[PDB]
Design a protein around this ligand. Sequence first.
Ligand code: J80
Ligand code: J80
Ligand code: MYR
Ligand code: MYR
Ligand code: MYR
Lengths: 235, 235, 60, 5, 5, 5, 268, 62, 62, 62, 283, 283
Amino acid sequence: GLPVMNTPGSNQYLTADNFQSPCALPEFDVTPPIDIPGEVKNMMELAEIDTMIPFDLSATKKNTMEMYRVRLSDKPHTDDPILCLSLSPASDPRLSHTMLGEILNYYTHWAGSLKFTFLFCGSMMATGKLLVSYAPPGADPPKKRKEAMLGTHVIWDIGLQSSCTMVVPWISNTTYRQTIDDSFTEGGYISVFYQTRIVVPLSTPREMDILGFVSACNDFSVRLLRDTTHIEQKA
Amino acid sequence: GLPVMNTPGSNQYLTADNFQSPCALPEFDVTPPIDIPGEVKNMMELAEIDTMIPFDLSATKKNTMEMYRVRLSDKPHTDDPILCLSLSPASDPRLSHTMLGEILNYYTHWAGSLKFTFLFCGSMMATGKLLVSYAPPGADPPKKRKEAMLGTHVIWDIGLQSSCTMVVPWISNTTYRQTIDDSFTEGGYISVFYQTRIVVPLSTPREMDILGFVSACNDFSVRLLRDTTHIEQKA
Amino acid sequence: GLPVMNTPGSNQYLTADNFQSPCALPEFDVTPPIDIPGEVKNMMELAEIDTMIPFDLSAT
Amino acid sequence: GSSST
Amino acid sequence: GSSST
Amino acid sequence: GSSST
Amino acid sequence: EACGYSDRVLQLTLGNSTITTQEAANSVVAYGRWPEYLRDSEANPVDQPTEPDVAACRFYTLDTVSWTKESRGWWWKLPDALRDMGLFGQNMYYHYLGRSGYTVHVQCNASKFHQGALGVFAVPEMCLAGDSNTTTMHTSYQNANPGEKGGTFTGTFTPDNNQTSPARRFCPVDYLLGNGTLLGNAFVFPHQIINLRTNNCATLVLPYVNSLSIDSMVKHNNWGIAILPLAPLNFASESSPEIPITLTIAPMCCEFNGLRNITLPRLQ
Amino acid sequence: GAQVSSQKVGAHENSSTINYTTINYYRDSASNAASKQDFSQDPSKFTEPIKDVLIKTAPMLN
Amino acid sequence: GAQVSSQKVGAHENSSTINYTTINYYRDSASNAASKQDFSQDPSKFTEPIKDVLIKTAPMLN
Amino acid sequence: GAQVSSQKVGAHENSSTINYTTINYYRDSASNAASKQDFSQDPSKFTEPIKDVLIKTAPMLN
Amino acid sequence: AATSRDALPNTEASGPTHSKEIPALTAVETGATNPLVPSDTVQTRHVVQHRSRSESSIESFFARGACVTIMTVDNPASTTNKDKLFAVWKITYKDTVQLRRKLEFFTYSRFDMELTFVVTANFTETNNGHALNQVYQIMYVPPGAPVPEKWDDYTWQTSSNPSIFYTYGTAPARISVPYVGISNAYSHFYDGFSKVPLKDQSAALGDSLYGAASLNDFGILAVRVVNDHNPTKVTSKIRVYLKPKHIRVWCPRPPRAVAYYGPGVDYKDGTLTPLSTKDLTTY
Amino acid sequence: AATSRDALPNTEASGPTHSKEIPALTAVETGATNPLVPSDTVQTRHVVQHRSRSESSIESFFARGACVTIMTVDNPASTTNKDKLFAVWKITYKDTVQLRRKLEFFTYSRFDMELTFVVTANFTETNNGHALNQVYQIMYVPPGAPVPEKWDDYTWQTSSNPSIFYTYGTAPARISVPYVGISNAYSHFYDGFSKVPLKDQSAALGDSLYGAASLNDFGILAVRVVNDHNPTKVTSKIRVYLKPKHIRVWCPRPPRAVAYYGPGVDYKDGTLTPLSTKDLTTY
Ligand SMILES: CCOC(=O)c1ccc(OCCCCC2CCN(c3ccc(C)nn3)CC2)cc1
Ligand SMILES: CCOC(=O)c1ccc(OCCCCC2CCN(c3ccc(C)nn3)CC2)cc1
Ligand SMILES: *C(=O)CCCCCCCCCCCCC
Ligand SMILES: *C(=O)CCCCCCCCCCCCC
Ligand SMILES: *C(=O)CCCCCCCCCCCCC
């Protein structure tokens, strides 16, 4: 018959291959699709949905409903942080289990801009101004408002629009960052501060919670599909 | 020769495959076809032919000519069933061996409408009205005319047109039902009742038989070819 | 190279097969035919010729 | 050449 | 023949 | 190309 | 028709014979094919055929049988049932080859106070099961071919144990259609039902069916007629009622090839 | 000599008729694969073999 | 019946669109390889499922 | 250089001439398969080798 | 023009009725099946049907390779007193039950035949020797041709018979056969005899089997191991798979309801009660 | 018209702002995510974007063959008192965790299925005998069909069931399956029962498992070694790889965060604390 010659790769099974193969059920009458609501075309669609951050993974609050609540109070102005967070969306414990973090753990490389939205869940009678910051990597991580002030930041005034969004702009040396903790591809620091202080009247709760959400901006992409460490099967 | 590369599937034998192969008798002078009467193009043609139901599979009537005869009589009106039947065309013992049931046992999935025709084999002098019912699944199976009345039904008046047909309309949640007893794909209940009663004059037999037939409507189809349990070969 | 997949029948030898195969004597100068009398094209031509029947197959 | 269907 | 894309 | 027959 | 015509009233005429019926339930043409003569395009023996026309294609009435409450069923094979029937039979035995279609007319009348339903089935290649559990395919030609007389079905398989002088006959169990398949499905074969409240008769027009255009009528039967009580005979209150069943069959479009001396079969 | 035919496409990718190509390699038809391009017929010769055509809305017997 | 499509060419040789050819060998679509010629959609049904269309520069609540 | 020829189709599927394709891969004719596209001749040189043409209805000898 | 894979008819919407038209009433005595659809007896909605009868087409129903036989051959030590076993099989679909039952839904059939051969071998003795790779010869011997008497006699030369030489370990062998019948269709049932008993002639002379036509219809497959005797004995089996392709069928029949008993329609006492107990008024 | 491999939007240059437009302020109570880009809250330069979401398309995410099961079969000596082991596997993606978790990002799915079979074998006893090359039969038994009871019973004839005959040592076997569901999409979750408990009926009679629809959805794979018993016992394993191709998915869900405990959404005590300790003000 036709003179052929076998090349390397012959008879191997690459699990990522894309070939035709014989159908075991020929002429099977397939059930047609119906128009089910909620179709997804790309995993990044899900990364663009806001999901709530477990900010407080302290020994007594972790793995409980409490890990999601950042407590604030009407105390006098301090320049100390409300919260401190490393921009490591797939590996930092507070970000790694969010819908964004979970999709990122199926891939080796991420790139793009992120946005953090905070929701004030205190009474209507409570007022306050907060500073939300992002410091690109390379200097001392901000532990005081004075250093956080110098980087990318939003001063959030609490009022009828309950929530505020800070965009963390894609500022990187490499074209893509890794989905693991690695100094070469480190992303920087998110920190929140009191700009003035929370002020309540009398007969009002002096303590309240804020909730935080993270999602991806439309310029965000991931690549090199990999297996996650977030699920396993011993035996 | 031409650089080729073997894919998975190479050298396997799929019994459902469809490939060319060398002819062992080249240039053989084939006998031409003649126009034989009765050609069949599709197994469903046979399922559309009426076949007689073995309704009475009682311990003494089963596997005898008697299993096909449903006995009626001129007794006073009762609301109790003449017969009760589960709509399980491939697995119910009364339907599974009919031509329809037999073709269905070569396939995993069935769909479509069915029709049951009853033939009154009593004398011409005998009169009567009967109620033939179909209850879709999910409630108490009808044991009294009052419940059967509430579902799909035909009130059959006996007279010169000897036979009556009840169509069981395709009413299912799934697109296809399975050819086994399975609650998820259960089809419902067929039951027959006396609407008034059978009335004979004197010198007439007070007992008579009706015969029943089942066949498929033109919207009926089957899929996923499989082996039947209705034939076997120990050793 | 080109992704291929082996079907059943691969490597078998059917004695009634009809395939090309490499020539062991390339460029061999073949002797031409001459017009020999008596060419046959089909075995049935021979069956149409009258042949004598051994009718009497008696023991002697 | 190509008999289409 | 060749359906291009 | 294609010699048909 | 407004001028009186009906599906219940028919007149059939073939040759010098006419059948009338006032209580028919229409009539069946098997597989939708009317009998025809062998076409030149499907022909195989090259000799001029014998076509007896009116001398053979006419109505022959076979012996009347009797339907009772004990009756399990009756069977006949074609052409065998007609082998001694006038010039059809003569033409059949003088030729090696023959083909034929048939009009089958089953007759059974009773009264408005009787009940019962006969299933009349026309089966292509009706191979029946034999009486032996030790040997198979062993029914003698004599037993396989009852002629006009036909044979009967049984409700019980009872195996021939005489291994030294085997009966060599069929043992056709009724609910298994005498062949190992269930009677309720026999309706995929061309059929009619004589339900006594509805009709006195059944009429089946049968094409020649075979895997060959023409064959040996003496070695091979093409059609089997099976008549079984789907619903038993009943009348008023009489413990032992009886009504006759008469079978009348006409060969149709029959032709014969290979003429020679007459075949004289060993039928006993 | 290539034969090109349509596939009846069941489950669609998130990705217009799709075709497949067939070439016969052997002289004998028996060597050919099964086309599966088959026809359907009306069941009448089995379901309605009666000489007088039936109208379902009318009395079967008259 | 050959299908010809463009490759999105990443790392270029020191060497104009590059193409690849595809032919389907089987009658059933299920036997076919994955095209990978897929579409993208807008995330709105998940990110913005609100009845009244939002304008980002405007107050979300009003 | 493809050669396309008709198959004499015997048993037909329930599914118009069917063809098959042939390409020769080798320079030497000896390497080629058997065409089987053969001719028939009249048996006369064997069955009727007589100098004076015979008429079957006429006396062979006269 | 109706293709097998065309969709079935749509359900049309149907309203209430008070008419002299009577679809529900009929008379099965006529021999006909009442051609009713749901809209004739119930109120229906409009449904656009998408289902198809594609997989129940006669091709599709049979488009699968079924096992019709298992052949045993072997290659013993030279020193054994038993002959080297070559296998002989008379070709038929009747030695196994599954495909036989599917074909017997019909009286007659026409098809081209695809035969696939699966070959397996194993060591017989708790020995430790070995054998080199075996080559098998599958020879078709058509009715008339010399049947082999010895694994190595002249018949295996196959100058005119078709033979497959199969190398162990390669993909299973496969060939196609045309419709080879001497009739216009294969008869799955033959209500007749191959001989007429003549009055004048001996009872023993006119006798033949019921339902049997040619005493040898299709010949036999003869299989052997071409390799010479090894010291270690190897036994091999050849499983034959048959697929009817390009098939046509005529005259439908009820399926076999009781166990097969031989090549004919015969049934054995004790196998005749297929149906289970179920009461008339029990769901 | 947006292809998966199209580049994402360019960053547009943005200048200073002193406006009544407030992009940064919003109200998540509404249910919406604020659609902001960096230029809304910071000064940006013009970037021409080249990145693409090509590898995170639903096809691409699943375009990989995952192990869904490991089947064990063997071929023992004839003399052993234990039966020859053939394997039976009820088809599912739920016996292993990795692909299951990826599919469970979505409530419903439609896809064609590619199955690849990797087969390995080894010697069991510190013996010195040998076996000839094995052929394996992988038979698909759909719900309803006779399940094999013995490695060699009649069911393995496969007249209608699909079977693969695999020769050991050749490239791994592979087949494709269409979308075979009796629903318009595969349900990864079914918040319901297959039976209604009826008042009038026995408690035991109306009972069924939570979340389970057909008691046998897809049937089983039955695998055996076709070769007859060798004196030396060989054990073999068949690893099955599943790849969803031509896939569509509906209704997104959060990923499984705690270890799987069975076919349903159930979790086991002791596996419920996935998250690590990290302090609120610690980077
Ligand atoms: C007696 C009942 O069964 C039948 O009627 C019946 C009818 C048709 C069937 O088809 C058999 C036709 C056999 C033709 C043979 C011709 C060629 N065959 C070959 C050819 C070459 C080789 C190497 N091996 N086998 C094998 C098959 C089989 C059985
Ligand atoms: C119960 C939870 O899991 C599921 O919902 C779920 C849904 C879909 C999945 O797909 C299974 C569909 C099975 C269809 C089968 C049909 C044909 N198969 C074949 C065919 C031939 C051969 C030799 N081997 N296998 C094997 C697969 C698997 C699991
Ligand atoms: C019609 O077929 C003309 C085009 C041919 C295209 C190439 C065919 C591929 C090689 C087939 C070789 C012949 C098989 C014996
Ligand atoms: C469209 O496909 C017409 C051109 C065909 C070119 C040759 C195809 C190569 C051989 C494919 C054989 C068919 C696969 C079963
Ligand atoms: C005439 O043959 C022109 C068309 C060629 C079509 C492709 C042929 C398939 C490959 C053949 C290679 C050459 C064999 C040495």
